[PDB]
Ligand binder design. Structure first.
Ligand code: CLA
Ligand code: CLA
Ligand code: CLA
Ligand code: CLA
Ligand code: CLA
Ligand code: CLA
Ligand code: CLA
Ligand SMILES: CCCCCCCCCCCCCCCC(=O)OC[C@H](COP(=O)(O)OC[C@@H](O)CO)OC(=O)CCCCCCCCCCCCCCC
Ligand SMILES: CC1=C(/C=C/C(C)=C\C=C\C(C)=C/C=C/C=C(C)/C=C/C=C(C)/C=C/C2=C(C)C(=O)CCC2(C)C)C(C)(C)CCC1
Ligand SMILES: CC1=C(/C=C/C(C)=C/C=CC(/C)=C/C=C/C=C(C)/C=C/C=C(C)/C=C/C2=C(C)CCCC2(C)C)C(C)(C)CCC1
Ligand SMILES: CC1=C(C/C=C(\C)CCC[C@H](C)CCC[C@H](C)CCCC(C)C)C(=O)c2ccccc2C1=O
Ligand code: SF4
Ligand code: SF4
Ligand SMILES: [Ca+2]
Ligand SMILES: [Ca+2]
Lengths: 40, 80, 150, 141, 137, 731, 31
């Protein structure tokens, strides 16, 4: 039954969160550092 | 940009300049060899680093050395 | 190939109704079965003088000698459609490699004087980021692997 | 330099030429005079027909210009040694590149400065332990 | 070549925002959005994970509302890194906040269009006919 | 043109292409190459990195504790450790269907769960932790310790707390503190914990943070420690009928030395482990008083080095103190070497002398831990060599280390490399020839002609410690040797443990062990040869006598002079990685197959098939894969389905590496230029311009990515095989 | 006995501390 452990409403949010958190921020960071550019 | 040096072991045979495909290397009058000339690299901004000079060197080990460095649009050979 | 990966992941997840099989999301090859049926009905339509079909693989009787079979209809389903597309993909990549080996043996945006270097040559120095394996010889060296893989 | 006079070569257009970045960032042009009307191979692909007399062609990078220049003098009996390669900026600024001082860089010439010239052997370069933590290389010193 | 430039193509290549004549950065991606979530609903109409349940017209809607959100970031976050701020001098797509608003077609656009497309498919209009088993008449 | 990525190297920032990103990542921790990096800021950034890394390790351990105390069946496994499978963590995957759901609801859990194979349940029940609350308290304590170390790093990055460069370059004090405190005091405190908690918990006596100040670990307190007589702590040892966790068969001894294996748990004795830690703690504390400090008395390493000269070695070890003390790559290469050797030693010791209760019976956990530590050490050694090459490239001073033992290594490097090549040929030739000969001889229906060499030199060593199955009558195998009549307390336990045909303590070997050992010797000699030629010829050669001017890692030198591909000292590391992986494949095949034979009681299969390669290819690879490939079938899905998927996944990644390793850059640069033209001419797409000019992956990056994919597909595939095939016939 | 429900919530509040201190050390190492 999915959660035989205490506080079963945490693993849910924890899996989506890591899903749309760490690599999203990681891919955005390189982008942002590409943004400064330099038109001369 | 890449770094191109020419050492005193150069005999001034213009081979490295005859092999250079981007007009990076020249020849200036010197006083070390029979030909009285030594290789020169004024336009390092056009040097891609294809090592075509070093391939065309006659002396025992190279007299001209190419050291790759911070690659740019011109050194990367980008045509697009 | 992504179809095979999806089928492996579905059968691994325990989800049979989500597969590309003959018992789920079917991928039936209509054209090949149609031409099979065409070759089957040949002796009585578009070939009155012909008594039997060209091959019994398209459809018809099952000829067998001694205790083993000689040739029988080769039913084409999802597992045949997927492998045919795999073959087409591998042949396409091999053709791409062996074609860029010829359409760029003369020159390219990377090397404009490649025609001077000849047919068989390793490269043109580590410059330009790296000019390794640009000749037509290197393209044939790569196309050998893809012909093998196909 | 002042003006880039020249006739565009007979060519039916190809996809190997210059692009959007090549027009906005920088492009290269080469000017030469042809003794007659003949066919020459394009460094971008195909075979074109150069016009009689002064010609002009724009390319993407410099190596293409020099590859065409090394082709002009070697393949044709009326050899072309007057091909001049220019770099074009997005502001119309055109500067001279090849040949540099009017003479090919092959043979020597008076009026050139020694660039990158060292007074040692390669086996005489200093040890990297003596220059570490400094923004210099064993060949830059 | 005819495909690159012809009679119809010369205008149609020049008819969508970044080539269309005088279109504002607000509508910078009308079609670029009106054509997204409408055809993203196709593969989810008869093939999805929830293709053989009771929500045949729901998984596609939510998946489209997420995929448009992904393609919106892959649009604006890059737009800012290719050009700084304010606007430009040629095309309003190549503009900074202009590209940030190039999503104004994904946003609102798809969130309403892909919404109504399945809001018409989950339902079937209230009009039918039902038998009578009363006897009480 | 420069932008801001990276901020530590202007050269990589000025790159206007996509490469600017890649080399901005692969040079993140190369602090020595940053812009204007001084020698002090270097060491200080590295110090803060050490603090953060200690915190990371402790956070990982805290998570390991948390998931066991939260989702694991620790208390149930304590009841029946030989039949209840441990629980690692619970699954929360919204992609499961029905087969995986019915399968993963295992190990007594009422939900789809993952079995545990890291062998931590046995460790925690051997320590004395018997309830989830103790594990939870430990996890909270580690969560606090990690923050302690994080703040320590953050505070030491401040100028007032910034340690001086002369503080970092202090060798005579760092050692006296790491040995007497980090090694001696730590071992002593751990021995105290083992005596005060582990031993009472083994006898039903619960000792926690609420009663340890009053309950003594022995009926007689600290006064019998002061008594010159110490036999009272040998006392009545735990009898051979002792039962763990209960006071049945338990005595009062805490510091013994009877040796052998606990007959029930098939592991080591707790009193012996505590006594060992006490002895070695005394030894390390004594070691911590050797080098002088602020009190005159003591040694000076710079004098001891510069004093050990030689008539055949010239300068001996002179100036080696000022050499090693200034080279961080030298220090890292020594540390990685020693740590890898002791990691391989931990592996080669825990499988035959297990210290945790009931851990010998679980075969999957024991098969996983050994291979894990062996791969760890196999990376550690390659690192030790890769950093020595960097010492030669960046930190070797030929005038400081002139004529010493280090420079003479460079003076005769040709001979070293030549003899390494000779011994590798002498191995490979004959080992391969004998394997092929055995295969050819067995295939012809004539198994009576196999060249089966008896490993005499190793079986005799086994006899020198008490193994009587061979009967050499030498040293401990002989009852009349003076080594047995010493009244040694450990002798009776050792002699009983070694010869019982149930354990892994000195397994009986034969010709197959001999041949696989010579294949292992080849794998060591050749890998070391590659890693040593890469380090020696890292400063120059006759192809590139100026290799020192090009640094450590560089693409090549060009197609001239015949060719210069894979010529840097980094490329030699890249090549030797393959040999390390092959050696660690051979070693793990050996271990797993022989342990299958020992576990199933079928040592005959291994002892009679490992002499020819077809035995390995069939009776091991093909034979033990049946369940592995049957994790998910057209008939059902069992608990091995995730491993059956990971096997093919590892195959896919391993084969993906082949693309980067076989095809090289220029092809891909041309194929990329075609796509660039395609985009810049596509209507409704050229208006999508790119700041980063897309370029193909460099040659160095090519080899790195290919080797990384190869290594991932090499480790994951073999792990999915080793765990799945073990959790079937015995798990 | 098993683990309580509020203690699992006490775990995240404590884990806030290593996250925050690691953020501080990370930003201090970037310089
Ligand atoms: C540093 C090692 C480590 C690792 C590899 C993991 C890994 C995992 N944890 Mg976890 N966790 C850790 C430490 C770790 N944790 C510590 C020290 C704590 C105490 C604060 C927690 C408390 C915790 C909770 C409460 C939960 C997880 C959960 C999970 C799983 C979901 C991913 C996630 O969002 O994690 C957590 C992100 C930050 C802690 C995942 C397998 C979830 C789970 O059970 O998935 C089924 C979940 O609910 N962890
Ligand atoms: C190119 C190979 C390929 C193809 C054709 C499909 C096709 C499909 N997958 Mg699938 N999948 C693939 C690879 C592929 N997959 C791989 C490699 C994985 C990871 C191993 C998955 C994992 C996966 C999962 C977990 C699920 C699917 C599902 C589906 C179905 C609905 C998905 C959908 O409509 O989204 C939208 C599609 C588009 C928006 C296409 C638009 C692009 C235009 C036409 C161009 C669909 C028939 C889901 C399903 O409902 O099961 C039947 C589902 O649960 N896939
Ligand atoms: C379409 C294929 C697909 C996809 C998208 C996923 C996705 C996921 N799986 Mg999964 N899995 C798959 C196929 C797939 N799986 C198959 C075929 C099997 C074998 C039957 C498994 C067996 C499996 C197990 C045993 C576990 C997962 C877990 C997870 C989650 C990882 C959570 C995490 O660590 O944080 C972010 C994700 C990556 C960093 C994640 C959402 C883990 C989980 O539930 O989280 C704790 C977990 O333990 N999967
Ligand atoms: C008895 C006192 C004592 C103790 C217990 C320690 C303990 C430790 N020191 Mg340390 N050290 C000490 C005194 C001490 N030091 C003194 C006096 C100096 C000045 C010379 C140093 C200078 C020093 C440096 C430069 C470094 C350490 C490091 C370390 C850690 C080793 C890495 C590790 O955790 O692996 C496991 C430990 C045992 C298995 C460790 C916890 C390293 C570290 O990690 O940085 C925090 C490191 O870089 N120490
Ligand atoms: C190095 C870690 C360590 C620590 C922190 C402690 C701490 C303690 N031990 Mg202890 N002990 C240790 C190691 C350690 N021990 C080791 C390695 C042994 C040998 C196995 C012992 C054997 C031992 C005995 C026999 C006793 C203690 C006792 C004690 C407690 C009182 C000691 C005392 O009177 O003050 C310090 C005395 C200075 C002269 C105390 C909390 C006593 C106890 O249990 O309290 C009732 C006690 O009887 N210890
Ligand atoms: C305590 C362990 C340890 C530490 C602190 C380092 C630290 C370092 N290594 Mg290293 N290395 C190690 C173990 C370690 N290594 C092991 C075990 C191996 C064998 C697999 C290697 C093999 C290796 C190679 C081949 C190279 C380095 C390099 C480096 C430097 C740059 C790393 C980087 O930022 O790249 C990126 C980090 C992640 C992508 C850096 C100072 C590079 C260097 O330039 O040396 C100065 C380099 O060429 N290492
Ligand atoms: C360079 C070749 C070489 C190498 C690297 C090894 C390595 C190893 N051998 Mg071994 N061995 C060798 C040659 C070699 N052997 C030869 C030629 C023979 C005779 C056929 C043996 C017979 C042998 C036995 C019986 C045993 C080992 C074992 C071992 C392992 C334990 C180490 C040891 O026993 O001490 C070191 C081994 C030696 C010092 C042998 C001398 C090798 C010299 C230095 C090389 C020159 C040999 C030369 C041809 C001799 C001339 C013979 C003469 C009659 C003409 C180890 C990995 C043991 C084992 O199986 O481990 C489980 C074991 O019991 N070896
Ligand atoms: C490897 C597995 C078993 C294989 C067979 C063993 C041979 C391995 C190949 C090594 C060949 C040795 C070549 C010697 C080269 C040589 O002749 O050098 C000459 C050297 C003379 O040195 P000096 O007399 O000048 O010594 C003065 C010192 O202060 C050095 O400055 O003689 C020796 O060093 C003899 C000892 C060999 C030391 C090298 C290896 C030692 C083996 C490990 C010893 C462990 C001892 C306990 C340490 C904890
Ligand atoms: C005043 C004082 C005295 C009295 C001292 C008293 C009354 C208590 C002293 C306690 C001392 C001095 C040290 C106790 C140290 C406990 C330690 C160091 C525990 C460390 C735990 C670590 C490091 C991590 C453990 C882990 C955990 C958390 C897990 O759950 C997984 C395993 C592992 C990762 C190992 C006397 C008169 C006696 C001597 C003079 C000084
Ligand atoms: C590159 C390089 C380097 C190198 C490194 C290395 C490589 C290391 C290592 C090492 C190792 C890897 C080692 C090993 C070894 C071995 C040993 C050390 C041994 C031995 C022996 C003994 C001593 C024993 C004894 C005994 C016996 C016989 C048995 C019983 C017990 C007894 C004890 C009796 C360096 C960085 C420095 C520098 C730079 C260059
Ligand atoms: C395919 C290929 C390319 C082209 C490869 C390219 C252009 C890379 C494209 C990969 C994109 C970026 C997606 C990769 C996805 C990764 C898993 C992302 C990892 C990045 C981390 C930050 C997560 C080469 O440049 C090359 C060079 C030399 C030898 C062989 C090859 C080669 O085989
Ligand atoms: S080929 Fe080399 S030695 Fe000869 S002139 Fe040119 S640079 Fe000098
Ligand atoms: S390295 Fe190549 S491009 Fe550069 S100067 Fe030498 S020959 Fe010319
Ligand atoms: Ca479904
Ligand atoms: Ca307890």
């Amino acid at each position: 039954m999915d959660g035989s452990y205490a506080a079963s409403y945490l693993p849910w949010i924890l899996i989506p969160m890591v899903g749309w958190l760490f690599p999203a921020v990681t891919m955005g960071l390189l982008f942002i550092h590409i943004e400064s550019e330099g038109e001369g | 940009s890449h770094s191109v040096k020419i050492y005193d072991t150069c005999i001034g045979c213009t081979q490295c300049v005859r092999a250079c495909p981007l007009d990076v290397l020249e020849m200036v009058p010197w006083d070390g060899c029979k030909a009285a000339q030594i290789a020169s690299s004024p336009r390092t901004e056009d040097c891609v680093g294809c090592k075509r000079c070093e391939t065309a060197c006659p002396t025992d080990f190279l007299s001209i050395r190419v050291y790759l460095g911070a690659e740019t649009t011109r050194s990367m050979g980008l045509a697009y | 190939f992504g179809l095979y990966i999806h089928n492996d992941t579905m059968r691994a997840l325990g989800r049979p109704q989500d597969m590309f099989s003959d018992t789920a999301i079917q991928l039936q090859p209509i054209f090949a079965q149609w031409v099979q049926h065409l070759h089957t009905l040949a002796p009585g339509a578009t070939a009155p003088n012909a008594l039997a079909t060209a091959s019994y693989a398209f459809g018809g009787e099952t000829i067998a000698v001694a205790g083993k079979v000689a040739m029988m209809p080769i039913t084409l389903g999802t597992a045949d459609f997927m492998v045919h597309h795999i073959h087409a993909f591998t042949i396409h990549v091999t053709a791409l490699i062996l074609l860029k080996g010829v359409l760029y043996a003369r020159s390219s945006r990377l090397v404009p004087d490649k025609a001077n270097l000849g047919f068989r040559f390793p490269c043109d120095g580590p410059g330009r980021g790296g000019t390794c394996q640009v000749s037509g010889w290197d393209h044939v060296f790569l196309g050998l692997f893809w012909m093998y893989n196909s | 330099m002042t003006e880039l006079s020249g006739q565009p070569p007979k060519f039916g257009g190809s996809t190997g030429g210059l692009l959007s970045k090549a027009n906005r960032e920088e492009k290269y042009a080469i000017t030469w005079t042809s003794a007659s009307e003949q066919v020459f191979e394009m460094p971008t692909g195909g075979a074109a027909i150069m016009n009689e007399g002064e010609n002009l062609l724009y390319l993407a990078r410099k190596e293409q210009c020099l590859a065409l220049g090394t082709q002009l003098r070697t393949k044709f009996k009326p050899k072309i040694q007057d091909y001049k390669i220019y770099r074009v900026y997005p502001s119309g600024e055109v500067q001279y590149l090849h040949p540099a001082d009017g003479v090919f860089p092959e043979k020597v010439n008076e009026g050139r400065e020694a660039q990158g010239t060292k007074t040692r052997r390669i086996g005489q370069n200093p040890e990297p332990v003596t220059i570490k933590f400094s923004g210099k290389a064993p060949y830059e010193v | 070549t005819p495909i690159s430039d012809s009679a119809f193509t010369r205008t149609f290549i020049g008819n969508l925002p970044a080539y269309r004549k005088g279109l504002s950065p607000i509508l910078r991606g009308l079609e670029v959005g009106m054509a997204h979530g409408y055809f993203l609903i196709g593969p989810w109409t008869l093939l999805g994970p929830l293709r053989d349940s009771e929500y045949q017209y729901i998984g596609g809607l939510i998946g489209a509302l997420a995929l448009i959100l992904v393609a919106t970031a892959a649009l604006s976050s890059y737009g800012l890194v290719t050009f700084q701020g304010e606007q430009g001098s040629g095309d309003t797509l190549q503009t900074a906040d202009g590209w940030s608003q190039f999503a104004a077609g994904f946003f609102v656009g798809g969130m309403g269009g892909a919404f109504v497309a399945y809001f018409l498919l989950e339902n079937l209009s209230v009009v039918d006919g039902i038998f009578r088993g009363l006897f009480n008449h | 043109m420069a932008t801001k990525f990276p901020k530590f190297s202007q050269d990589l920032a000025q790159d206007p292409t996509t490469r600017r990103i890649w080399y901005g990542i692969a040079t993140a921790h190369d602090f020595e190459t940053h812009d204007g990096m001084t020698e002090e800021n270097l060491y200080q950034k590295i110090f803060a990195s050490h603090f953060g890394h200690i915190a990371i390790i402790f956070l990982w351990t805290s998570g390991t504790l948390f998931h066991v105390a939260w989702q694991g069946n620790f208390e149930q496994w304590i009841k029946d450790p030989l039949n209840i499978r441990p629980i690692a963590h619970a699954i929360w995957d919204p992609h499961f269907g029905e087969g995986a759901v019915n399968a993963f609801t295992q190990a007594g859990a009422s939900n789809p769960v993952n079995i545990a194979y890291s062998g931590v349940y046995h460790w925690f029940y051997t320590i004395g932790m018997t309830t989830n609350q103790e594990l939870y308290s430990g996890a909270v304590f580690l969560l606090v310790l990690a923050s302690l170390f994080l703040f320590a790093g953050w505070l030491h990055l401040q100028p007032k707390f910034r340690p001086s460069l002369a503080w970092f370059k202090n060798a005579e004090s760092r050692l006296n503190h790491h040995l007497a405190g980090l090694f001696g005091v730590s071992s002593l405190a751990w021995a105290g914990h083992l005596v005060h908690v582990a031993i009472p918990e083994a006898r039903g006596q619960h000792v926690g943070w609420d009663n340890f100040l009053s309950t003594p670990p022995h009926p007689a307190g600290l006064m019998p420690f002061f008594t010159g007589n110490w036999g009272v702590y040998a006392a009545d040892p735990d009898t051979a009928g002792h039962i763990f966790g209960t006071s049945e068969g338990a005595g009062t001894a805490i510091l013994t030395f009877l040796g052998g294996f606990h007959p029930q748990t098939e592991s080591l004795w707790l009193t012996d482990i505590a006594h060992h830690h006490l002895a070695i703690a005394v030894i390390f504390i004594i070691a911590g008083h050797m080098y002088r400090t602020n009190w005159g008395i003591g040694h000076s390493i710079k004098e001891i080095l510069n004093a050990h000269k030689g008539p055949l070695t010239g300068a001996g070890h002179t100036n080696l103190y000022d050499t090693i003390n200034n080279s961080l790559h030298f220090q890292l290469g020594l540390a990685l070497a020693s740590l890898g050797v002791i990691t391989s030693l931990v592996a080669q010791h825990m499988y035959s002398l297990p210290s945790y209760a009931f851990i010998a019976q679980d075969h999957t956990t024991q098969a996983a831990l050994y291979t894990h530590h062996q791969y760890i050490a196999g990376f550690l050694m390659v690192g030790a060599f890769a950093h020595g090459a960097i010492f030669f490239v960046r930190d070797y001073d030929p005038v400081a280390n002139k004529d010493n033992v280090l420079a003479r290594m460079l003076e005769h490097k040709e001979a070293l490399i030549s003899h390494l090549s000779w011994v590798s040929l002498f191995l490979g030739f004959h080992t391969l020839g004998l394997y092929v000969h055995n295969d050819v001889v067995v295939a012809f229906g004539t198994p009576e002609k196999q060249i089966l060499i008896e490993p005499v030199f190793a079986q005799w060593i086994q006899a020198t410690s008490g193994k009587a199955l061979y009967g050499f009558d030498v040293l401990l195998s002989n009852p009349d040797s003076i080594a047995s009549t010493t009244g040694a307390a450990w002798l009776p336990g050792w002699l009983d443990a070694i010869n019982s045909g149930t354990n892994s303590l000195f397994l009986t070997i034969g010709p197959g062990d001999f041949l696989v050992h010579h294949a292992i010797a080849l794998g060591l000699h050749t890998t070391a040869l590659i890693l040593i030629k890469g380090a020696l010829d890292a400063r120059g050669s006759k192809l590139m006598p100026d290799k020192k001017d090009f640094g450590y890692s560089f693409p090549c030198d060009g197609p001239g002079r015949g060719g210069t591909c894979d010529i840097s000292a980094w490329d030699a590391f890249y090549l030797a990685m393959f040999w390390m992986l092959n050696t660690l494949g051979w070693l793990t095949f050996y271990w797993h197959w022989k342990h299958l034979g020992v576990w199933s009681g079928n040592v005959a299969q291994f002892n009679e098939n490992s002499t020819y390669l077809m035995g390995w290819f069939r009776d091991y690879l093909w034979a033990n894969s049946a369940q592995l490939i049957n994790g998910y079938n057209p008939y059902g899905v069992n608990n091995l389905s995730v491993w059956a998927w990971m096997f093919l996944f590892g195959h896919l990644v391993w084969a993906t590496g082949f693309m980067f390793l076989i095809s090289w850059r220029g092809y891909w640069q041309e194929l990329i230029e075609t796509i660039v033209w395609a985009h810049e001419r596509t209507p409704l797409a050229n208006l999508v311009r790119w700041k980063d000019k897309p370029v193909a992956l460099s040659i160095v990056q090519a080899r790195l990515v290919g080797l990384a994919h190869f290594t991932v597909g090499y480790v994951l595939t073999y792990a999915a095989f080793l765990i799945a095939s073990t959790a079937g016939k015995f798990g | 006995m098993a683990l309580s429900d509020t203690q699992i919530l006490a775990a995240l509040v404590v884990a806030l501390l290593p996250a925050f201190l690691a953020f501080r050390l990370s930003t201090e190492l970037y310089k």
